[PDB]
Swiss-Prot record, chains A, B:
PANTHER family: CHOLINE TRANSPORTER-LIKE (SLC FAMILY 44), CHOLINE TRANSPORTER-LIKE PROTEIN 1. This is Choline transporter-like protein 1. Residues 44-48, 64-69 are cytoplasmic. It is a multi-pass membrane protein. It catalyses: choline(out) + n H(+)(in) = choline(in) + n H(+)(out); ethanolamine(out) + n H(+)(in) = ethanolamine(in) + n H(+)(out). It comes from the Eukaryota. The chain crosses the membrane at residues 12-32, 70-90, 93-113, 114-131, 259-279, 281-297.
């Protein structure tokens, strides 16, 4: 159902470009005058054992056994995704690289002597770049999900998905990163005022919670766009309804996946960091291991969230019949 | 589509009854040892004029003209409902009566010398009785809505709907009044602590807002149950989706209906209270007029909320075709 590429949002692409031009004008105006990645596959067996031992020793928890089984099954499929797409795990370094290049440009142009372009620019463009990662991962994962066999592009993560983002759907990302910018900046202003006084803790924490809610929603909205190739509002509303109807499954996947994945990166970098010391003192190895383990499991979580929404859409439409077959793997629930 | 009466929820009916028995045990254990109702019809013409004059003298508001037209049309139909059901306006006095009888029992049994049954009892049972009013009104209004002609029970509000609540759906109300009880009591505890200190204003106000959100949702869930005759969770989820998809219409109906209906009761009791004084001092007439005008327009608002959800369901299903006709009145939008 993926063979429809309709660009979906143009006004917000134009606003993003026009802003970037205005920022460039101000710039020029003042100038001219030992890895943990092993977990990406094996963590699918560790997670099932972890649950198995935790529930030994109370039994009211059994009503959730159906919801945890889904969470575990999704991790198994996520392992298959990274096996099929060897380049996917490395994708965060191109995002980091791009962020650095922008940040160096930003800080260098701030030195030349309107100012609101640099304050808004820094935040909006950085969120834009990060939101582009979310669309890019969802594209590659969706392509895998809806392929019924082993035939694909040899290097799908760099041969596909990014081409669709830049050619068609770049406007959809622009709108989403703008919406979150309108929240991230007010929160920073309140934090500044608070420290200069000090009773703003409640309103600052509320906006912080809002940021997480909007981010999660945007990530699902981007995936829904990649599948249905519609505009932002339609994708966000469709994904929202699915998240509400399956809210019990979303809460389980996010609470259990977070606990398990947290132990994943923490336990493996503790083991790696203490290995080979033999009573010799540096901790630079421990910091390295933390940073790479975090970026590897961060994108791992993204793949699981995309697979969940793909499953839900694969049951809202395309039900079973002699002429209709599911795109899902053998995950029956 | 209303000919299906399936009881919908039994476990929460049993829990409600078992609690009431436990409360009765504790009781016995310690013992044995000039009206404003004219508005119910004419307010449908006053509302349209009020909007007409307010928009004379800015024009950005015109984008909402489609949403206000719906709000006005719903008020017109609400007038028809009260004309067809003359007994409906008087219904709040039986709710008040029932609340008094319980409250007298409660306070009398508190005097005999476990205590948690009286604290939880007072709140849960009172919300139960009030929630029963919400189901009762929705039943009568839904019956009118889905009747295509003038044939009905002569005294439908007392001949129907209450029979369905007591015979089938009493368990559905029990669950809803329990959920709101779990919020109303913590809020009261925080208010108590605050006055004995004083920095709890934020968390108290948040719970208060939550109470209004849950109440509104429950009222729509009860109406959805009356139509679809399903269980609470299914009705609440279905009504929730409709409220989100039409959120722009809900915000308009609640913000404009509240402003107009507020003026309705306030203006008419001011006029009645100052009438016939002729320089004669009592204000007991003004208080009487306020109290009756409030209960009359409170149930008026309930009828409008039920009609809105009925309209939405009448367009989600039962679309136009040679074999399908809408149940709605001539409200085309
Ligand atoms: C309008 C003109 C002047 C500027 C256009 C800039 C475009 C081409 C830039 C801005 C943001 C960039 C994206 C930001 C982040 C990533 C993640 C990375 O892992 C792969 C490349 C990818 C997906 C980039 C591709 C190129 C991109 C879309
Ligand atoms: C279990 C046994 C002993 C007691 C059962 C008591 C039941 C029948 C009582 C308790 C609360 C009552 C409801 C409380 C309030 C109202 C509002 C009124 O406008 C119509 C009747 C209605 C909807 C009542 C119907 C009867 C009711 C459901
Ligand atoms: C970070 N999670 C995705 C696990 C939860 C967001 O609410
Ligand atoms: C009281 N209203 C129904 C008007 C609004 C509730 O949020």
């Amino acid at each position: 159902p993926l063979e429809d590429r309709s660009c979906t949002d143009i006004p917000w692409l134009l606003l993003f470009i026009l802003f970037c031009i205005g920022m460039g004008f101000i710039c020029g105006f003042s100038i001219a005058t030992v890895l943990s990645m092993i977990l990406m596959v094996i963590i699918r067996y560790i997670s099932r054992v972890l649950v198995w031992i935790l529930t030994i020793l109370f039994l009211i928890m059994l009503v959730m056994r159906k919801r945890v089984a889904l969470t575990i099954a999704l991790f198994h499929v996520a392992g298959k995704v990274f096996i099929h797409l060897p380049l996917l795990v490395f994708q965060p370094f191109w995002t980091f690289f791009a962020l650095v290049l922008f940040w160096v440009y930003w800080i260098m142009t701030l030195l030349f002597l309107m100012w609101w372009y640099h304050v808004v620019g820094l935040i909006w463009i950085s969120e834009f770049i990060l939101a582009c990662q979310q669309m890019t991962v969802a594209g590659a994962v969706v392509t895998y999900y809806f392929t019924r066999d082993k035939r694909n592009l040899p290097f799908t993560p760099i041969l596909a998905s990014v081409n669709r983002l830049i050619r068609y759907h770049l406007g959809t990302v622009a709108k989403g990163s703008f919406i979150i910018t309108l929240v991230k900046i007010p929160r920073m202003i309140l934090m500044y005022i608070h420290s200069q006084l000090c009773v703003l803790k409640s309103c600052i924490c509320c906006l912080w919670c809002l940021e997480k809610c909007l981010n999660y929603l945007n990530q699902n909205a981007y995936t829904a766009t990649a599948i249905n190739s519609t505009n932002f509002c339609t994708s966000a509303k469709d994904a929202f309804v699915i998240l509400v109807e399956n809210a019990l499954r979303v809460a389980t996947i996010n609470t259990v996946g977070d606990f398990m994945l947290f132990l994943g990166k923490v336990l493996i970098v503790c083991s790696t960091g203490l290995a080979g010391i033999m009573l010799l003192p540096l901790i630079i190895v421990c910091l390295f291991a933390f940073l790479v383990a975090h970026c590897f499991l961060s994108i791992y979580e993204m793949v699981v969230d995309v697979l969940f929404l793909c499953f839900a859409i694969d049951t809202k439409y395309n039900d079973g019949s002699p002429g209709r077959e599911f795109y899902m793997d053998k995950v029956l629930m």
